[PDB]
Symmetry: C3
Subunit: 533 residues, 3 copies
Amino acid sequence: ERMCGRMSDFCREHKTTLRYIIWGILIAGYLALVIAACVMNFHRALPLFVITVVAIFFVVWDHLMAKYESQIARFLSPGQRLLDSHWFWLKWVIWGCLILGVILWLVFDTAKLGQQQLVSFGGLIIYTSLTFLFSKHPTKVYWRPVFWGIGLQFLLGLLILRTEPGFMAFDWLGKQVQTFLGYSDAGASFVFGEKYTDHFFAFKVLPIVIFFSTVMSMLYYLGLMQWIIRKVGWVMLVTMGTSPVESVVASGNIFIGQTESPLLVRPYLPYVTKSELHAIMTAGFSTIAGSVLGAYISFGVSSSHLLTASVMSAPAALAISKLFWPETETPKINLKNAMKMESGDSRNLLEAATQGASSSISLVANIAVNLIAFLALLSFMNSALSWLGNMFDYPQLSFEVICSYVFMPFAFMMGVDWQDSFMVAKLIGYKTFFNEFVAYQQLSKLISLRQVGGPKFVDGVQQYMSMRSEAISTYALCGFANFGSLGIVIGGLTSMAPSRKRDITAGAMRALIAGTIACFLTACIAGMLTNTP
Amino acid sequence: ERMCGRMSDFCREHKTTLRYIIWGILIAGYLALVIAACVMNFHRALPLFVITVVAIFFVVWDHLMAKYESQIARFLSPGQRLLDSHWFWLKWVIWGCLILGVILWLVFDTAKLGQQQLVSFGGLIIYTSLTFLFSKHPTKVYWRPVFWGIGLQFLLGLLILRTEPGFMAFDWLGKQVQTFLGYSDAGASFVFGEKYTDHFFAFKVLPIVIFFSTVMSMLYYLGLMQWIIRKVGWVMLVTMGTSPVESVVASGNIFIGQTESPLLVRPYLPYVTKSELHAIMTAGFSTIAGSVLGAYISFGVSSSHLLTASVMSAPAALAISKLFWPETETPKINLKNAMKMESGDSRNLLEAATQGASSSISLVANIAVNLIAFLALLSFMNSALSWLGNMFDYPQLSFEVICSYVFMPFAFMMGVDWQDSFMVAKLIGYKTFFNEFVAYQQLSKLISLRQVGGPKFVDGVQQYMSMRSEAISTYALCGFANFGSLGIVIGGLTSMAPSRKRDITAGAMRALIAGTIACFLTACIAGMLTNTP
Amino acid sequence: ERMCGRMSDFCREHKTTLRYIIWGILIAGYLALVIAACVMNFHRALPLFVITVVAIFFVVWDHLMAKYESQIARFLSPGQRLLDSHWFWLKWVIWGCLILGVILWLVFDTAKLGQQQLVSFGGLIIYTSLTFLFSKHPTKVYWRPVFWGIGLQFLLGLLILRTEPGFMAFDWLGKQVQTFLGYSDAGASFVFGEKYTDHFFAFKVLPIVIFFSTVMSMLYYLGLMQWIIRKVGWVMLVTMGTSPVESVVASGNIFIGQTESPLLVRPYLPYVTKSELHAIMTAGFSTIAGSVLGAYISFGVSSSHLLTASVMSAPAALAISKLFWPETETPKINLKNAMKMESGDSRNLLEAATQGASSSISLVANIAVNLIAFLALLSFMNSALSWLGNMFDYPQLSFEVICSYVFMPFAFMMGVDWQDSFMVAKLIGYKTFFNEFVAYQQLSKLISLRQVGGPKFVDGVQQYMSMRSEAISTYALCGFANFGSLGIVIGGLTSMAPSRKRDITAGAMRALIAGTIACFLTACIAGMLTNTP
Ligand code: NA
Ligand code: NA
Ligand code: NA
Ligand code: NA
Ligand code: NA
Ligand code: NA
């Protein structure tokens, strides 16, 4: 077997030049297909040309920043030194201009929209002030991440809600998610048949959760999910001044659920502070997950708003966390260690597909059983309350009637008009005492009634509300914060870090309240930028 | 933050007087609603007045017994000393009166009802005598728990089956369980749709098991389930003279399944004797669980009888256990340690709801798969037996035909008439070789046919039986004793106490036989008190 | 209790003579029923007489071989010594006759059938030669198991495909499996109702997997599955010269899946060589399991071919394993230790039924979810490829079009005609990138279209292919080899033998490729023996 020995020596001799040449050939093939496509017809091939360009730019970009990091840094140092020399007097000029601009925007845009928009700005001040008064360390507050986290949300809103490019971008992005959730029907129509639509939620909606979970596991194997997380976590780290670990877990919670996002920093969890641990739990309570995103879109909830609320919830969570539990210790973990994300144990892309499908088995089982239980309890609670009410000639008493009054101040401060504030309060109740599946199922009913066009009042009962109030409700409800999830959060985190059980249990309730305040902050900014139709 | 420091000092200074005042205000609110209700209309508010009274009585009762325990005990000591002085001659007078009363009841009530009722009394003597002859220690028998356990069942039967108050109480109690199992439909109609009734057992019955499991976990968090268990376990402990640990696990098995009720005494399991371990396994084999109670009621099985059989099965199990395996050692665990029941790890009532729903996932999965398997095996066994029978011109041979003859003596001794004893024997077979889901599904068929009113015989084949025989069958079938559950019992108990694997394995088969005898004892007492229609 | 003491002494005194007499009475009862049946009517009782005879023969056979093993061995030694004396010149005579016979069979049978049959013989030479050239140790090849493993497949094919007795035997055997998969409907029609057929795959096909899994666990408790495995593993051990451990795991993989068959030798896994570990993984990739056999028959795939492919896949796997990774070490485990199979922990046959049902819960859950995911990915991949193709005026581009060209040479070498080789290539693709559920669902479509009788071409598109090509495809697709199963195999084996993780990971990819080559070897032998209709 001399030939077998020679072939071996060839490979080990020039392994780097063999495998690199192969990729280069593959790349040339792709580029040949693209250029040929544009030649045959450019307008038809435009989306394939755009994708190719943006990918090339980032590949080049990321390559340059990695090699010329030392040179770029020193080239920026003379400027940073000059600013720190004049910053003692220049800070009052920059602050004064920002304040002036906030006043001008209120006077000339918010005040024009109306009173409900001004009230939304007041709720932002009130929700923030209450977070300070009830802070763990009201004298230790670092105010930089509070003002940057609110400013970033406002900039995102302006771009996305108040410009055509950002509006067109997130309307397009939402329509792609709708098209993508239809592919699950091919799998659902074989396992459950052509009559799979006889059981809509079980045989059509839970397959979407399986498919999206499968896709997310493929993007983590490829390293595309980690590539976006580092980009977003760096913007928040360099503006807000937040620690690397809590910046990475916040950007990851935009796409990943609360029980899986701390795995992005699993080795370094036993050494995080009490404030970083609080931020890790707040970020999970203030966001949702991509696996369940398509389920809410299937109900009839706006895809654009869901995507916008999720992106705005990362800087809101860190701003409320750092104000509800500021940092009194010194952080140990550095940037390089936080940005490295130990990828899973999948040898190929088809093994990553099966691991994501197998992991979805327990998710869809718990979704289904919690909804059977919660909705049976509600039916019982409402029969008991009518039994009791009838003893005072008020058999209308319900869980909805009580929540319409208990949570109505929170909705009014988000800028919902008086009438609809009693209908939004009911949804805050469903989310708080049950979950956001229940709440979003009820909101979708209200959306459908309005689209039909029937009467708004029947026998003095309001049937549906405005579109602005459905928007504000979409942001307020976008989070995994509910009283029953407090134990699966504590347990899952202790499992990753058993040495910290004492600290985890102490920060979990404050983190759930901060999560709710974070989602309400997003709804006040949306409310102050949306007009009244 | 001086105000924050002052507010802190106020709370830590008078924490006891702050939280107590709050509860007192809440209590005054409740009482105000009740009194106002009765004022507006008393007859309508009666059930809310009754509930409030019985709760107040027990709260006061339990408070007095806890404080004045030492005084009450000594006040009873002069009487107990006098009785132990005259007990040497007074024991013959009390025994003679009891015997006389048993004879008078047989002559003037049982003999009037008929021959089938007298046979039921004979089966009680025969089942008990066989338990002695085949005892582990026939010379070590302590006879006090054998005669009290039978007497308590007879008193319960008289009260519940032979008085209007006890009959009305348990008929009312059963109708509340029926109303309560309808709330699960609100959850089932969303997850599975309006067509959830196209798949009755899977999409309507298994949601009842989820809902009841959810509710039981809420009552354990509140401490209401443990409060009833201590009351019942104390009556059996003070009459029968049974050990605290086996008295607590028997009363808990009325409400809790066999794999979860030993958790009521998990710390003390490595130190229980061989007789207490046998009793722990017998009690689980002689009872059912609240989670599956509503499933059998959905079939059409009487709710009152199921509840009565479960309560009577606790003193029957201990009487048969102490006769099949008497105590030859000294018990270590005392009363205070057995009555303390380490409650779970739920921080609130909505976390207790989700833990009970999540735990039901594996229960309903195993119920469904065991029924697919058992009913497919039966179809195969019956085709093989017809194939074989046809070789002798008897293609009617079946599993039912064989069991109608093998188990017919056991049914006749419970007081079932000759004809119907061959139909009850088939049900004993289904339970023994399969489970009590199969058996109760078959009994419900027979109940429906009788209600319809068709012919009782068609072509010489009896279609349905009497109502007394459906009652006796309801008691005989109320237990988790079947040959296939012997391994999930051993495994689950070893997990809790790995040091005792050797003892657990030695007492498991004797405990399964004792379980069956215990359920048959209940059916003989029901049979001797029920009249022939 | 003197009588209880005497009865005890009687049993302990003559326990062996008491329990043996009982079995003898039971046996006499069975024999009495059989003889009586034949007397009443022999032709009707024939299948019960045949079964009884074959059982008696093996019981006697196995008893004689166990007692007279030493005598038989020495009686054969003079013959074995004579052969090893004349074997130096007699080896050329036996080899020359075998070769001559292969030539005569090609000239006078294969060449008569046609060109597609001769090509199938060439593919056998080509697939085998490629396995050598790419071998791990091309200079260390022991050629005895390569020629015996191919010869055994050819003998099995001749017997089963080219004689009436073997054809009638495996057609009868397949019809019994069809009858047996109908009993699951009794269980499916109660859990899911009379409308269980509204969801065919979920509510009718997955109950077959539950029932077959239940039955296999009962046959392992009885020791009937281990009794067949030893018989088949001994033939391969005494002909091919393979190690005891890899002979036992190959025969067990005919009936048992790949994640459970190494449990037949769990204690001895830390001491197996690198070649035996490779063979253990190849055998699992080249076979299927009895639990999923009925699911493929429900699609419409031939029962006889599935059974034949499974039996032929055991000697093919060992022949390709020993050529792709020959043995360079010394094996430690001996025959007695490999043939002993530690049976499970079931105390009776009804506990073995419940353990097999409970184990099927995760199997049917993973089957269903992987199919929802794989079929949703396919729908997406095909829409993306049409989007891209349309940029060149070729919107027909699909995953099927690409696989019809990539895998067409592999199908042509198995002897599929030119036209149908593009349709078989699509199925090889489905299996490789997804699984054999997807592939067999697509093959069944093609079978049904042909049975209908419609047009074979519509608009230039071939709709169905020949019956010979459906046969060849049935053998090529009978294996659990796919890229996504590589991680559940590694993990499950490491769990059994954590010390070998390094070796397991190194042989897993070579074992998956060898698995595929093994299934393709079976299809070339089937193809060279099947005629063109
Ligand atoms: Na999240
Ligand atoms: Na949010
Ligand atoms: Na119980
Ligand atoms: Na019972
Ligand atoms: Na296998
Ligand atoms: Na195969």
